[PDB]
Amino acid sequence: MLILAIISLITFVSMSKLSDNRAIIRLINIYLILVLVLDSFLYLLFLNNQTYTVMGELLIFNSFTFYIDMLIYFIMIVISSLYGYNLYNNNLYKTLFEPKKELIILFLINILGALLIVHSNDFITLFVAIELQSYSIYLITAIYNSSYKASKASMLYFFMGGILSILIAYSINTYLNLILIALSLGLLFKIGIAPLHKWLISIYENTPILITIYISLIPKISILSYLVLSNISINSLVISILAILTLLVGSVGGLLQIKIKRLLAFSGLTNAGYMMLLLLLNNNEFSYLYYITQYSISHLAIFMIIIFSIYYINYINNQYNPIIYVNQLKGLIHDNAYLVLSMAIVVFSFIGIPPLLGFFGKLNILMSILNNGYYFISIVLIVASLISALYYLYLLNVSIQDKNNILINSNETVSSVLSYILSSLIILITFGFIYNSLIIDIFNVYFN
Amino acid sequence: KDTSIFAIEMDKALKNHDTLEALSIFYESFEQGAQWENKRLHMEAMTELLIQYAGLNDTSVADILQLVQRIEPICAQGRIPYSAETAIAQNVLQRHSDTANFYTFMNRQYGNTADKVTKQDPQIRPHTYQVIHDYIYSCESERADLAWEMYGLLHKFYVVPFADYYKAIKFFAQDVKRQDYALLTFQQIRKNHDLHGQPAATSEMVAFLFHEFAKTKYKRGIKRLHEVVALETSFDVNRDVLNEMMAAYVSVEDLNRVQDCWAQLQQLPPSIGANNRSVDVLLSYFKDNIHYTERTWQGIPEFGLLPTLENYEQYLINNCRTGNYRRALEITKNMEIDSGLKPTAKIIAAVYNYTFTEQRKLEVEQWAEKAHPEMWLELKEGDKLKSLCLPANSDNDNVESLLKQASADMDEEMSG
Amino acid sequence: SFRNVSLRGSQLLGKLDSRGWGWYVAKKWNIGLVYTMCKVFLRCKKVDIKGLDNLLEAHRQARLEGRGLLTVMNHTSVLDDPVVWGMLPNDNGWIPYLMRWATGAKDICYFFGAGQVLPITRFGIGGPFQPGMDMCVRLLNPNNKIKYSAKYTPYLVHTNATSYPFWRESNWVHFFPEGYVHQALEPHEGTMRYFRWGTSRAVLEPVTPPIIVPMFSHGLQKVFQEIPKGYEMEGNNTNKDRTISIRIGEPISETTVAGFRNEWINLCHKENVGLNAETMPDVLKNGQEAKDLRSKVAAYLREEVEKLRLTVPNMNPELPEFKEPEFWSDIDKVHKGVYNHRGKVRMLRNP
Amino acid sequence: ALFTSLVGASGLGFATKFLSNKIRLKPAGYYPLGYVFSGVAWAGLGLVLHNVHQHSLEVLEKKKTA
Amino acid sequence: MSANPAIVRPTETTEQVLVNFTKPNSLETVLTKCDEELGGYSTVNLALERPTTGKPYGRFFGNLSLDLPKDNKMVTRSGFAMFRTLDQPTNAWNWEQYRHLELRVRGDRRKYFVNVQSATPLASDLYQHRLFIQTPGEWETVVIPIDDFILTNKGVVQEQMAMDTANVYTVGIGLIDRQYGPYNLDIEYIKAVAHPPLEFKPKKEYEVEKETILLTP
Ligand SMILES: CCCCCCCCCCC(CCCCCCCCCC)(CO[C@H]1O[C@@H](CO)[C@H](O[C@@H]2O[C@@H](CO)[C@H](O)[C@@H](O)[C@@H]2O)[C@@H](O)[C@@H]1O)CO[C@H]1O[C@@H](CO)[C@H](O[C@@H]2O[C@@H](CO)[C@H](O)[C@@H](O)[C@@H]2O)[C@@H](O)[C@H]1O
Numbered sequence A: 001m002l003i004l005a006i007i008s009l010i011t012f013v014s015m016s017k018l019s020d021n022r023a024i025i026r027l028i029n030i031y032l033i034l035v036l037v038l039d040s041f042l043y044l045l046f047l048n049n050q051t052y053t054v055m056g057e058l059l060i061f062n063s064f065t066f067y068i069d070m071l072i073y074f075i076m077i078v079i080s081s082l083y084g085y086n087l088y089n090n091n092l093y094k095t096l097f098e099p100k101k102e103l104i105i106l107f108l109i110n111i112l113g114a115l116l117i118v119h120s121n122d123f124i125t126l127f128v129a130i131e132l133q134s135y136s137i138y139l140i141t142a143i144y145n146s147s148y149k150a151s152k153a154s155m156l157y158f159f160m161g162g163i164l165s166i167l168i169a170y171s172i173n174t175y176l177n178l179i180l181i182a183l184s185l186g187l188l189f190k191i192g193i194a195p196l197h198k199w200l201i202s203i204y205e206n207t208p209i210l211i212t213i214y215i216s217l218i219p220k221i222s223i224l225s226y227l228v229l230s231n232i233s234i235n236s237l238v239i240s241i242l243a244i245l246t247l248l249v250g251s252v253g254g255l256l257q258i259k260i261k262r263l264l265a266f267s268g269l270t271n272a273g274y275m276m277l278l279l280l281l282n283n284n285e286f287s288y289l290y291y292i293t294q295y296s297i298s299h300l301a302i303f304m305i306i307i308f309s310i311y312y313i314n315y316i317n318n319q320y321n322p323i324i325y326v327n328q329l330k331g332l333i334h335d336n337a338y339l340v341l342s343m344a345i346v347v348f349s350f351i352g353i354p355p356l357l358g359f360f361g362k363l364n365i366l367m368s369i370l371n372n373g374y375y376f377i378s379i380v381l382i383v384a385s386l387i388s389a390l391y392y393l394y395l396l397n398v399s400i401q402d403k404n405n406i407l408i409n410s411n412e413t414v415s416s417v418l419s420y421i422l423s424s425l426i427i428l429i430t431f432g433f434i435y436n437s438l439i440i441d442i443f444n445v446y447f448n
Numbered sequence B: 001k002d003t004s005i006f007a008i009e010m011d012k013a014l015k016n017h018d019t020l021e022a023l024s025i026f027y028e029s030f031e032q033g034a035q036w037e038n039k040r041l042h043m044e045a046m047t048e049l050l051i052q053y054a055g056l057n058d059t060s061v062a063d064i065l066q067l068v069q070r071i072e073p074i075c076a077q078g079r080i081p082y083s084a085e086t087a088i089a090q091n092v093l094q095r096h097s098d099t100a101n102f103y104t105f106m107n108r109q110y111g112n113t114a115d116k117v118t119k120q121d122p123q124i125r126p127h128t129y130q131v132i133h134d135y136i137y138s139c140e141s142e143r144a145d146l147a148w149e150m151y152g153l154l155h156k157f158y159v160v161p162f163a164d165y166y167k168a169i170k171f172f173a174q175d176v177k178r179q180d181y182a183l184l185t186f187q188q189i190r191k192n193h194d195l196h197g198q199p200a201a202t203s204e205m206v207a208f209l210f211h212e213f214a215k216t217k218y219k220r221g222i223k224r225l226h227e228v229v230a231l232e233t234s235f236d237v238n239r240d241v242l243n244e245m246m247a248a249y250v251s252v253e254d255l256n257r258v259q260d261c262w263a264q265l266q267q268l269p270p271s272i273g274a275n276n277r278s279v280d281v282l283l284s285y286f287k288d289n290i291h292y293t294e295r296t297w298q299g300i301p302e303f304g305l306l307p308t309l310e311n312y313e314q315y316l317i318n319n320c321r322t323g324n325y326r327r328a329l330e331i332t333k334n335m336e337i338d339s340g341l342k343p344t345a346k347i348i349a350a351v352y353n354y355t356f357t358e359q360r361k362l363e364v365e366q367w368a369e370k371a372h373p374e375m376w377l378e379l380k381e382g383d384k385l386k387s388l389c390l391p392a393n394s395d396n397d398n399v400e401s402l403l404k405q406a407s408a409d410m411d412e413e414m415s416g
Numbered sequence C: 001s002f003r004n005v006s007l008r009g010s011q012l013l014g015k016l017d018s019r020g021w022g023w024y025v026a027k028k029w030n031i032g033l034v035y036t037m038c039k040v041f042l043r044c045k046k047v048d049i050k051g052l053d054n055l056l057e058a059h060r061q062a063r064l065e066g067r068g069l070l071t072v073m074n075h076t077s078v079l080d081d082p083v084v085w086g087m088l089p090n091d092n093g094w095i096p097y098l099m100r101w102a103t104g105a106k107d108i109c110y111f112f113g114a115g116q117v118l119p120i121t122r123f124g125i126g127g128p129f130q131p132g133m134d135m136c137v138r139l140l141n142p143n144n145k146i147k148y149s150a151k152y153t154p155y156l157v158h159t160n161a162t163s164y165p166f167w168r169e170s171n172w173v174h175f176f177p178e179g180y181v182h183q184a185l186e187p188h189e190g191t192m193r194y195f196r197w198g199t200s201r202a203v204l205e206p207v208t209p210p211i212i213v214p215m216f217s218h219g220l221q222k223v224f225q226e227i228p229k230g231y232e233m234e235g236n237n238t239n240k241d242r243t244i245s246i247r248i249g250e251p252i253s254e255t256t257v258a259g260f261r262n263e264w265i266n267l268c269h270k271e272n273v274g275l276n277a278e279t280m281p282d283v284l285k286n287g288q289e290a291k292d293l294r295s296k297v298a299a300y301l302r303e304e305v306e307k308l309r310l311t312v313p314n315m316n317p318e319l320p321e322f323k324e325p326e327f328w329s330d331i332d333k334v335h336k337g338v339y340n341h342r343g344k345v346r347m348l349r350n351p
Numbered sequence D: 001a002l003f004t005s006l007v008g009a010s011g012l013g014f015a016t017k018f019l020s021n022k023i024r025l026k027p028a029g030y031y032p033l034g035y036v037f038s039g040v041a042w043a044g045l046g047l048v049l050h051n052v053h054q055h056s057l058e059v060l061e062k063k064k065t066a
Numbered sequence E: 001m002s003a004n005p006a007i008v009r010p011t012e013t014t015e016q017v018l019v020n021f022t023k024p025n026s027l028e029t030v031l032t033k034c035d036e037e038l039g040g041y042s043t044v045n046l047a048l049e050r051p052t053t054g055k056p057y058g059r060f061f062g063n064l065s066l067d068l069p070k071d072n073k074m075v076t077r078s079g080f081a082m083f084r085t086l087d088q089p090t091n092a093w094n095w096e097q098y099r100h101l102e103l104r105v106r107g108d109r110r111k112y113f114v115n116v117q118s119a120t121p122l123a124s125d126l127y128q129h130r131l132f133i134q135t136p137g138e139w140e141t142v143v144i145p146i147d148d149f150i151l152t153n154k155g156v157v158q159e160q161m162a163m164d165t166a167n168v169y170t171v172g173i174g175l176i177d178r179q180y181g182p183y184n185l186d187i188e189y190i191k192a193v194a195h196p197p198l199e200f201k202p203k204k205e206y207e208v209e210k211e212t213i214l215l216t217p
């Protein structure tokens, strides 16, 4: 699978000695595409509908893990494309994000940790993988630090999370439902949920946007994919309260944001609250896979849209986060009308307007929670969707205003690869529903 | 035979340009047990001996070092007379390239950097200082590094005048293309002003350095110089420094800093505010932006200024490179009437080259032939008129993107 | 210019334009489809274009400087209005504010709303001062902030320093100064009538002189004939090369426009009204001097278009009487056929 | 069954190329060979999906028959 | 429309007046510091001047001496004089939506500095940018980009880290001229402003005389 690919890539980069830090990224991208093709062929030829255990009894490989691996393939190919190919061949976008060999090594380590989280069958492998991912996130954030308080807060958050994980490991080693519940909240706290999210939204706000596009997506996918695959907290009141509170905070608290990346972090919190409701349910593989795939596509699409929008502003706050406030996108329809159309498609998918993928994901979640006797959380989900739609429509309203300003550097060659990838994501969001019956049948036969 | 007789004979042989005979006499006097000591004749004797030995092309450096080592005990404090200090220095520097041996030659006289500096005076012994100066300012870009060392050398044994600072910044920034050495020279000026008692650095130096950094897009130097200027209380920032900072940040394609420099320039009174150099920089910033170029051109009378030939040339380049060929041709035609400036060969060449269309090129050719026949004929004699045009966009590309590429190609071709 | 004219033009513009994202998309796609049909029609036939660059470069200069663009052309076909704009590039085909905003007809003197067509009355009611003319003047006005100048005085630093002069709004007014479709025959084929006073009013009124670009098309009168098979009759046809020739001349000299506007300024100073006055005096509306100046401007525009005419290979010199307003008086509207005005021209008249 | 899947996938590829051109502020039809390449790639993806879905339907019929 | 949520979100402003000497209660906002705390002989005084013509302003004046005090002997460089806004108790300012700093001053030949205290790893770190006086004796607005201040520790340039621009505590003007003699600075206000749009015209006060295309209102 990808585990071998990641370790081979780490070995290659560790002893590469290449002067350019983007040629190695492009080689990594080509390798990832080739390994995706090879692994898909291998799975559909010799690994369909099987659950293998590799090494000892620590790493599991099943259909769920394979599909999460494909999702990581797709996201990682997109992110490597963003890293390798400068969107414009100008100084601004070159200084916007400059990868370094340490950064590639750290990203590969983080991806390996997330994969081990997904493929974990034993609590030892779990412990190791989560600590590896947390250390990778802390180091990646510490590489780019423009403030002292932010660095201290990130360090304290990582230390507290590690201490909590160590305490959970010691408690489970001493030995039952209480231990599993404590582990569940310990894992859930690391992706950002209502009573402890503030630090993660702060870190996302104070991070380079081309780092934020990664660090806001992979941990959620990994943790929620491990949690869903290993059903240990079902019909839990604690998870119910946490999910309801996370939805309420992400929706109502998202209305109070004027910074674009704070708003995106709160949207991610709300979307995690949506998926965290699926932990209360039986037979939640298809719904969770659908929602995580569509959410990953929408997250990548909106982050690419914001990155594209950087070229149409007459000033830059700082080289790492050129756009900070939402009003910097006022009248963006008069600079690139189709970029605003794509952003409208993405936000309407986030709201859950048919026939976009977000609507189908939310409908799957809602049907699952209704057909098993949960009615209050259905109303909670609907109200949260409306309140989130409020600030999504705010972003639209700001971005479709009137702007008469003349822009310096109006023309330059937009990267063909990045624009094509963004268009592909938008078209996926727009017309993936035509493949819904095929997806359902494929999941019924192969993944079950 | 006394040592004085040997010295007289050696001096007489030297006066006949017979260096080998003088060396033979010296070695024979050593073989005969002659005693050499501090006496008036002897210093001149071996000084002329060393001068004439250094005057031989076939003489090796090792033999010179051996002779100097042999002579050193005779001389008091190991200090040969200044005539030898000039002639041997000239031989080592002008005729050969050995900076280490010459460095050790001074170190023999003065082996301590901070101690016993006993700084000399240029008027007393100008020959050695002139020789060192010529050696420093005669090296090319290949020998530039060594020159830098020699520059520091000149500051460790002599008190250079302040004009050498200006002309050394100019030499390192322009001639040998070592702009880092120019920045280090400026930093040395600042260090000597703040630590020692020396005259302060001038805003002219930093303006010149900013100009040279813009000439080669030296981003590191631009950032370091900006940081130095921000906290430097010995000199201020006038319009010239602001103009050159804005040019430097235009060269490195920075939005915020160019806008900051223009904001600083725009708030000064127009007497000491923006000038035609500011207009040049601001027109070169808006190369491919015709709207802000047009707003810049209309603002020249707003600041109490009148366009110059460079202003017109850059304005016409900006007009042609954005597709407005007819507008640029009309401006060129009416330039003499409205402004009183006669279009020159540079202006006509810029209009012709940047007009990437066969029909419009023919039109400008006809205008030039009818109006300035001899100038157009001169432009036909060399290779100033290029024939690059937009290719047929079989890729169905919009004219703006297809035209910016042509403008960049013409910029590269006319750069040199 | 005068305040009342601009106010009435703005009122009629607001009546015929909502400036809303809903109406804008409808107008955009309507104009784009019409332009696409005209473009396909043009490639279906044989057409020779000489000077398209002049119209394209004078439109971008006008929008760049905020002057406004004016176009003068001959009226030989009923459907020559949209068809001729099929030669324009796609940027000027689907962008409605980068497109024409007029139909013409130059007054009487003596899906159209989404097609950017304003109404002009061609009958003997009113005169050269109609709400359509006020609208044309208003669209030729960039702002109400700058003073009236005979020559283009730059103003983009005081207003529109970072803005656009005509932001998402057209400045391209295109008249048909003849007023009616002219379909003369051999030997005086392609000749025009006298240009009317409305185009002169659009030349003089705006506070910023436009960039007038003459045009001439010959051949569309052989397609959209006023009478059926009018040019195919025996003895009425000599050339069988059904070739459409479109010629776009150089923008006219700004010195002549500045001189005409200076005459307008002197006429304004003849009365006590200022350059920017609240209302137009009746003397300037119906007066000998204003009428003479308007006739002179119209004659100059007609002379420019006639000079452009000779570039068409199959043409003959025009009789000196054809340019005189008096020559086309006492014209008949009843024959409905091959008409023989004063035995000098043969026309395909169809009322 | 191949015709509809391939046609829809090719349409999706055409849409992706058109949107890529339009978000770059480039006219439709820019690099027309790109339309062909995008359509062919998406059609191949749709063909793979169709084969896998055919295997899915074949397996489903077996359980329903029994 | 943004509707009601426009009042629920944090308010946004295009400027923030840091120090305003126009009001007659300005001493309570700002505090002065000379070298007498180190034993130096340079004095610092501050006062509000309200002329009949023109807006009221504040006078930051004194006698910047550079004599080593004969009490402790362990001071070496013993000349400086500064004034800064009172210590920040919100616990800090927020400049993240701001780009420039505007100082309306009427300076002299003396050599002034703009000092900013924000969240730094060292409590003695200071962001400094020299106050460039261009027309001494006449009122002028000095605009200093906020990203052009340099980080120093007791006058020594340190490793360059960007200003936090979200935890700014105090701002003020200091005097490290290292020159004897009296000094007097007249200050109207110090504000933090956003990025100004491009202008291609001198300020209205510094306007050249010619015909105006604009119509007189
Ligand atoms: C959701 C879908 C929405 C997509 C909407 C499509 C709307 C595109 C309109 C059709 C379109 C692209 C055809 C591919 C389109 C998609 C292909 C399949 C997808 C089906 C949907 C026809 O393109 C023609 O252009 C030719 C290039 O010369 C090419 O011929 C061959 O190509 C190679 C063969 O391999 C050979 O190497 C090459 O030798 C051949 O020449 C062909 O591309 C084709 O004949 C657009 O082109 C048309 O419009 C413009 C160009 O803006 C053109 O005007 C240009 O610019 C004018 C000033 O602006 C100026 O007058 C002038 O500068 C120029 O005239 C037109 O003249 C016309 O060309």
Ligand SMILES: CCCCCCCCCCCC(=O)OC[C@H](COP(=O)(O)OCC[N+](C)(C)C)OC(=O)CCCCCCCCCCC
Binding pocket: A333, A337, A341, A344, A400, C021, C022, C025, C028, C094, C095, C096, D025
């Ligand atoms: C319920 C919705 C049903 C309709 C959906 C499809 C819309 C089709 C639009 C046709 C035009 C087009 O495709 O794009 C063309 C125009 C762009 O304007 P332009 O000046 O012509 O520049 C064209 C680009 N250039 C200059 C490079 C050539 O788009 C628009 O003006 C924006 C979309 C319509 C109005 C949006 C604001 C209000 C609604 C916001 C919804 C998010």
